[PDB]
Write an enzyme that holds these catalytic residues in place. Structure first.
Site: not given
Length: 1302
Positions: A747, A755, A795, A802, A855, A903, A988, A1258
RNA sequence: AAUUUCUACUCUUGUAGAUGUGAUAAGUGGAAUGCC
DNA sequence: CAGTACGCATTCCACTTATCACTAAAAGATCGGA
DNA sequence: TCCGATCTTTTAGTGATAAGTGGAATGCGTACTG
């Protein structure tokens, strides 16, 4: 002459989408009443239980077939070592020809074609092989035809439970057909016995005969170890290691017994073990005589043969019993600890410990085979007591001094001698160690048994008492058991008795380890069928009655329609197409002819009627059924499609082998005319236009015509269905209606979708319907993930909650602070908040709870699922044709192309450098963070948490979650810069064992799986904000890398991704190209140190600026140099003074400050060290009396002091300066500093912080691989072959970089 | 802290990126344990 | 006091490469019923 | 004894495709022996 946007529509790719199905109305109730989900669950469990039985049938037929294998192996060995010696193209062609020859040679045994075998049993083999890949595995036709495996009535009932349902196993049939295939397939049996095992056995024969003609006495030991193991008793040892014996070792048991003779056999724990074939070579190396040296100068590894494909292992070693429930192991430990508590082990153990004080310790000896853990437990280091004893028996006496160390590792030593050698404190250390071990044992006896295993603390406490028991068991094993020496017989008898009372505790620890480490119970998804054998295997309008899967589109919402087999019958549920003005659903009308090459002879030429008519007379046949007009098949096309041989007349293989171009052209023209005639006459394709195809004689290749013809036969239309019919069908249960749903169709959908939602929308776009760039495929699957049971915490209303981020979105909050702040905002503080909690408390944002977020909501309730495969870029061919040639032609036409470099590592995972064609750097930065929380700080914690929990017998978890959660956004960043710059990426190229090992130590597997995600994005590439019609959109996506199939087929270049050689890519100066040509392995002794001293030219201190000038030429120190020098003939090393300057922003830093870890001992221990070479050398010259302020040559003053300390110190300083890496993990100060001044007049320090040069090590490595890409581009520029060079040489790269820097 | 699924989040009953599924086989690497 | 390399075996866990399908139609089993 | 509808189980097969050398490529564990 081309564009960057022209790299699209070159080959086609296929992808699979995933969606959730939501029932609409009473379809869920009718599904529940029909009971399809429980039937499908029982069906899945029956399939999983029954798969081993068909596996047993296939194994049995396999080894029964390969018992009669009789063929030579000389020619393949000749091809292999000819290819090894020559590595020439014609030798490779001969090698692959003989490899295919041997593969089909063993495959003839499976077929029944080989002429060496008798006709009756190969006819039987042909009948059986025809029987394996058809449905006669269930009625027992080929089962009793083989007639060697028993099947009880439970097995027969389970096999009968799949009546009229053998098409469920079609994937199984293909997954066994590739096992018995002979086309180089990696899971095929001929490929294993020809490629994966025979070269290993051939080189094994070679190393055995070379070792035997080297040392002739070892055949005696080989024959004695064979007789002691008693395998291959009919054969002598050199007959085992010969080519005619590879007529055996093809079945599983023979390979297992060969590998067993390689690796030896072990009994159960605590006993001896017969040495394997390589163990005696390792012991010969251990002997360290001249035979050991002549053995080590040759190679000494016999590689074991790989296991056969479909079979199961069978070992002669001891296999420990495995517990299958918590109750059995916990009750068996209950009786074991009952034996502990009623035997009263603590009294006699304490008494045994007190005999160490009651009797003298000269009557108490120790086991010398494991004194090292004794030294580790008592003293600080394991070598301290051994060194102290050695010097102690030196003191009571260089060959006589080394007799002490010769004698000490093969005899038992009394404890009093150890106390005299290393002091009195080991007596009190020993008594306190026995006291603490008995304390852990008493705590184990005091700790009661638990009731279950689900909580982690129960596993922790059982682990802890188990470590107490095993530690007591080893503590009994410190002392020697035998009485050959002067131990007290009562002491030895008591320790022997108490150690065979504690003997089963080690095996108990092993079994508890074997059971407690296993994965916890969980419930996953399974396939749904609704009693349909071929559910959703195709959407075609003719086949949708029995496939039963159709889709609807309803004002932007996509629906799934599954009409079930009602009352055991396929009710012809049809809908009349109403007008589009009338409301309702839009039913899809698939219209597919699968493949032109596949079914144009399957419907015209390879029918049974035509082949029965054709083997008698040559009169052409007219075909009427499924043909609007009759079609004529003549002999001059039937011989072409059926030439009784491998190469067909119209195939390019015939023209390749023979070369009759005119006859091949005529045959191709006749076949092409016949194909066009079939598409004209056949009832599926009579209403399809063929005018877009070229004439007959224009074509050069048949597969080109098939690739051109295949998209024409595919078509989608759409019609409108009134919703009253759909609602009534769902109400009566005649149609089951599920909505294709992800949360993009929700909604409150505002922003960009996923994608897969974008491909799913672009599939059904009118532009795609007019011309299909991407295509929907069949064999959709329905899955039912059941209700996974977790406790629910969420919750609630009226709560304050928080946010993870701060007011500034750049700075996150650590989880340790996050949980405390979360406890505060919910007002459930279990602890007092800390000081940094006060510091960060008023800088945080909170929210009130709304919308009841839960959750793991998706796993809370049972959900249906639906996997659908689609094919993209469909108008192009299935395979590309010289993709890399086209890319290199584009780069030849566009010399101004930038190059970016990636790298990989541990300290910096990734880094970005962008260069131009002239080496000027565009942009460079870090993406260890993606402006979000820095993923490294959580990723290393996850790694160490898995490492800690794996030994603690906790849950293991996965690393791929955080891995790809970093790598998805990382991949997004590289593709964004890649398209924005139109650049060429470089990575590499590394050896496979290197990446495998480094995944071994560090849990950062990005050396290969970064490459996998970059390849599988860069081949099919769409962008969410691009328009669909433009290139880069969903219908014309960016094809930039070659179609990867395997790493054997994958090469040095895959389109726009370039692999450069690994060596000398990181530690090079970008200002002038400086590396140290020496190695420190060569300089070991002191005269070699003097040679390394004299290899330099002159050593002079410029008193004006304080730098020290040392200079070297490569025509000195040839032995110490690795044979790979720089191009520049001179190399002055500016040994600069430790003078402190400021960076670009102004922070003070010392030039030449070269940080090195100070090792406490040799074993790479110790912390880091802020060490400054120049003050060290001026102190050394002041100590040695060498004058430096003169400014003349100073190396003569170094070499006149012939003491080893001076040359050792200056060689150490040369090593401490010539290094390139300066890292500090403790403070985070890692940098690179160069010793050589440039021609501009400055030594490179990374603390310059100037944008034109790298910021880090690097960074410098990424810059170097960008210039190796530029070097390869230059080599492309002066090459006209439009191909590459097979890598580049390291010294060629160094010569290039020395030419271009200076 | 809500996801086809994962990851990081919460201006937003959701946001940004990524995502070839299923089956089968082989190989590899770690932890613990003995053993040489 | 460091220098130079180190074998095998059983349990568990995780992971990595490689191969196949990307299907409608022909062929065959079959079931009621005649 | 036989037939036609119906449901389940094989089947058909194209061109394209190697090629080659060297030791770092990046952080660093014991343990018998140099």
């Amino acid at each position: 002459m081309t564009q960057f946007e022209g790299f699209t529509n070159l080959y086609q790719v296929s992808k699979t989408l995933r969606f959730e199905l939501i029932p609409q109305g009473k379809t869920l109730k009718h599904i529940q009443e029909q009971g399809f989900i429980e039937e499908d669950k029982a069906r899945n469990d029956h399939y999983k239980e029954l798969k081993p039985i068909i596996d047993r049938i296939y194994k049995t037929y396999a080894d029964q077939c390969l018992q009669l294998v009789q063929l030579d192996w000389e020619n393949l060995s000749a091809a292999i070592d000819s290819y090894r010696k020559e590595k020439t193209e014609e030798t490779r062609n001969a090698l692959i020809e003989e490899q295919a020859t041997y593969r089909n040679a063993i495959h003839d045994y499976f077929i029944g074609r080989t002429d060496n075998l008798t006709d009756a049993i190969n006819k039987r083999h042909a009948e059986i092989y025809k029987g394996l890949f058809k449905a006669e595995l269930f009625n027992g036709k080929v089962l009793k035809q083989l007639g060697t495996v028993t099947t009880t009535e439970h097995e027969n009932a389970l096999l009968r439970s799949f009546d009229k349902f053998t098409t469920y196993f079609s994937g199984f049939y293909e997954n066994r057909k590739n096992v018995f295939s002979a086309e180089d397939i990696s899971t095929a049996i001929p490929h294993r016995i020809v490629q994966d095992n025979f070269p290993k056995f051939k080189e094994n024969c070679h190393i055995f005969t070379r070792l035997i003609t080297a040392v002739p006495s070892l055949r005696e030991h080989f024959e004695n170890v064979k007789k002691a193991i008693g395998i291959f008793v009919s054969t002598s040892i050199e007959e085992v290691f010969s080519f005619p014996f590879y007529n055996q070792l093809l079945t599983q048991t023979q390979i297992d017994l060969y590998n067993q003779l390689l690796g030896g056999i072990s009994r159960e724990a605590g006993t001896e073990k017969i040495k394997g074939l390589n163990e005696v070579l390792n012991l010969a190396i251990q002997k360290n005589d001249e035979t050991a040296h002549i053995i080590a100068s040759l190679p000494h590894r016999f590689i074991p043969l790989f296991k056969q494909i479909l079979s199961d292992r069978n070992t002669l070693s001891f296999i420990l019993e495995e517990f299958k429930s918590d109750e059995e192991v916990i009750q068996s430990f209950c009786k074991y600890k009952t034996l502990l508590r009623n035997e009263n082990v603590l009294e006699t153990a304490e008494a045994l410990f007190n005999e160490l004080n009651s009797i003298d310790l000269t009557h108490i000896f120790i086991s010398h085979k494991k004194l090292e853990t004794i030294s580790s437990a008592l003293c600080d280091h394991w070598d301290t007591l051994r060194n102290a004893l050695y010097e102690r028996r030196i003191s009571e006496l260089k060959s006589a001094k080394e007799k002490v160390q010769r004698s000490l590792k093969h005899e038992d030593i009394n404890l009093q001698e150890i106390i005299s050698a290393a002091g009195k404190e080991l007596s009190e250390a020993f008594k306190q160690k026995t006291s603490e071990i008995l304390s852990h044992a008493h705590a184990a006896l005091d700790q009661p048994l638990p009731t279950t295993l689900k909580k982690q603390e129960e596993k922790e406490i059982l682990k802890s008492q188990l470590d107490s028991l095993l530690g007591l068991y080893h503590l009994l094993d410190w002392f020697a058991v035998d009485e050959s020496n002067e131990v007290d017989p009562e002491f030895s008898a008591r320790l022997t008795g108490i150690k065979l009372e504690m003997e089963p505790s080690l095996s108990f620890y092993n079994k508890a380890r074997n059971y407690a480490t296993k994965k916890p119970y969980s419930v996953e998804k399974f396939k749904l069928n609704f009693q349909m054998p071929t559910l959703a295997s195709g959407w075609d309008v003719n086949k949708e009655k029995n496939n039963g899967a159709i889709l609807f589109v309803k004002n932007g919402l996509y629906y799934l329609g599954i009409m079930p087999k009602q009352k055991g019958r396929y009710k012809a549920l049809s809908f009349e197409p109403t007008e589009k003005t009338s409301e309702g659903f839009d039913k899809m009308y698939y219209d597919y002819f699968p493949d032109a090459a596949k079914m144009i002879p399957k419907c015209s030429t390879q029918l049974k009627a035509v082949t029965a008519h054709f083997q008698t007379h040559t009169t052409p046949i007219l075909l009427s059924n499924n043909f609007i007009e009759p079609l004529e098949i003549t002999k001059e096309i039937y011989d072409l499609n059926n030439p009784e041989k491998e190469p067909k007349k119209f195939q390019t293989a015939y023209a390749k082998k023979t070369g009759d171009q005119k006859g091949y052209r005529e045959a191709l023209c006749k076949w092409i005319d016949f194909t066009r005639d079939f598409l004209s006459k056949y009832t599926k394709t009579t209403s399809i236009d063929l005018s877009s195809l070229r004439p007959s004689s224009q074509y050069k290749d048949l597969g080109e015509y098939y690739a051109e013809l295949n998209p024409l036969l595919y078509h989608i239309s759409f019609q409108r269905i009134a919703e009253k019919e759909i609602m009534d069908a769902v109400e009566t249960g005649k149609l089951y209606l599920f909505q294709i749903y992800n949360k993009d169709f929700a909604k409150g959908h505002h922003g960009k979708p996923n994608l897969h939602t974008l491909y799913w929308t672009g599939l059904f776009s009118p532009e795609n319907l007019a011309k299909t760039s991407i295509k929907l495929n069949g064999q959709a699957e329905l899955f039912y993930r059941p209700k996974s049971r977790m406790k629910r915490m969420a919750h609630r209303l009226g709560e304050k909650m928080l946010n993870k981020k701060l007011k500034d979105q750049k700075t996150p909050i650590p989880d340790t602070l996050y949980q405390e702040l979360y406890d505060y905002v919910n007002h459930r503080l279990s602890h007092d908040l800390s000081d940094e909690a006060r510091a960060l408390l008023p800088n945080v944002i909170t929210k009130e709870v709304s919308h009841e977020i839960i959750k793991d909501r998706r796993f809370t309730s049972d959900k249906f699922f639906f996997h659908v495969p689609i094919t993209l870029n469909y108008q192009a061919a299935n395979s590309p044709s010289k993709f890399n040639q086209r890319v290199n032609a584009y780069l030849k036409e566009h010399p101004e192309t930038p190059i970016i470099g990636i790298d990989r590592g541990e300290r910096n995972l990734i880094y970005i450098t962008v260069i131009d064609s002239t080496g000027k750097i565009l942009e460079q930065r870090s993406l260890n963070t993606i402006q979000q929380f820095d993923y490294q700080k959580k990723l290393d914690n996850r790694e160490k948490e898995r490492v800690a929990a794996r030994q603690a017998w906790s849950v293991v978890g996965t690393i791929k979650d955080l891995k790809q959660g970093y790598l998805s956004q990382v991949i997004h960043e590289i593709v964004d810069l890649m398209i924005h710059y139109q650049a060429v990426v470089v990575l590499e190229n590394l050896n496979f064992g290197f990446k495998s090992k480094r995944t071994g130590i560090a849990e950062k597997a990005v050396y290969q799986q970064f490459e996998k995600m970059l390849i599988d994005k860069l081949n099919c590439l769409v962008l969410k904000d691009y328009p669909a019609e433009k290139v880069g959109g969903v219908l014309n996506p960016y094809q930039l890398t070659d179609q990867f199939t395997s790493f054997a087929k994958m090469g040095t270049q895959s389109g726009f991704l370039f692999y450069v050689p690994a060596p000398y890519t990181s530690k090079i100066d970008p200002l002038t190209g400086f590396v140290d040509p020496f190695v420190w392995k060569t300089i070991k002794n002191h005269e070699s140190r003097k040679h390394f001293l004299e290899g330099f030219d002159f050593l002079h201190y410029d008193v004006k600026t304080g730098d020290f000038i040392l200079h070297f030429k490569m025509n000195r120190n040839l032995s110490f140099q690795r044979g790979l020098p720089g191009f520049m003939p001179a190399w002055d090393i500016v040994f600069e003074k430790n003078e402190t300057q400021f960076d670009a922003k102004g922070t003070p830093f010392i030039a030449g400050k070269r940080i090195v870890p100070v090792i406490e001992n040799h074993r790479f221990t110790g912390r880091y060290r802020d060490l400054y070479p120049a003050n060290e050398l001026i102190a050394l010259l002041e100590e040695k009396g060498i004058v430096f302020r003169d400014g003349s040559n100073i190396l003569p003053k170094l070499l006149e002091n012939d003491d080893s300390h001076a040359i050792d110190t200056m060689v150490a300083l040369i090593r401490s300066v010539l290094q390139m890496r300066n890292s500090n993990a403790a403070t985070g100060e890692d940098y690179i500093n160069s010793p050589v001044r440039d021609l501009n007049g400055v030594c490179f320090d990374s603390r310059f912080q100037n944008p034109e040069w790298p910021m880090d090590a690097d960074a410098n490595g990424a810059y170097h691989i960008a210039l190796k890409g530029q070097l390869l581009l230059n080599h492309l520029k002066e090459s006209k072959d439009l191909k590459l060079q097979n890598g580049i040489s390291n010294q060629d790269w160094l010569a290039y970089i020395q030419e271009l820097r200076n």
